[PDB]
Amino acid sequence: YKKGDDASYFEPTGPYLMVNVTGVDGKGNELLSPHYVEFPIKPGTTLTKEKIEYYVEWALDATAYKEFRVVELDPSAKIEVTYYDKNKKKEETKSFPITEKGFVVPDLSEHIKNPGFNLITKVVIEKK
């Protein structure tokens, strides 16, 4: 048993990536206003820039732009996760940059079962 098919109508019960994307064309005209989607993820995974690109493309498939491809990702994008440290009794936030080498998804089990890894970006997309 792994991490769930079609994904929950409720809040996930495992780590997940929240994708918040704004799709623009090569001229920055906006095509798709912020669109949100959740993908379950497994701690221990290496998230590279290329993987993120695929996830955002998959995020587009539930929109009028499913036939479009991701051309460029905003170079200022970052993954951030916010949780409550159970030892420190405070809000803590970690940032991970999107790079070619990527980063390994941490296990935040000790603090939260289902952390949400936030990805807010703008991407250039064009029809395939």
- Binding residue for a second copy, selected from 5, 91, 100, 110, defined by CB under 8 A: 91
Question: At residue 95, what is the residue type?
Answer: S
The minimum distance between CB 58 and a second copy, in angstroms, equals: 24
The minimum distance between CB 84 and a second copy, in angstroms, equals: 6
Number of residues that bind a second copy (CB under 8 A): 7
Provide the token pair at 113: 């079962």
**76 makes contact with a second copy (CB under 8 A):** yes
**128 makes contact with a second copy (CB under 8 A):** no
**93 makes contact with a second copy (CB under 8 A):** yes
**33 makes contact with a second copy (CB under 8 A):** no
| Nearer CB in complex with a second copy: 2/27 | 27
**36 makes contact with a second copy (CB under 8 A):** no
Determine the 3-state secondary structure of 53 from DSSP.
helix
Provide the token pair at 78: 């970052």
E-only strand ranges, 25-128: 30-40, 46-47, 68-73, 78-85, 90-97, 103-104, 116-127
Cα 117 to the chain's mean position, in Å? 6
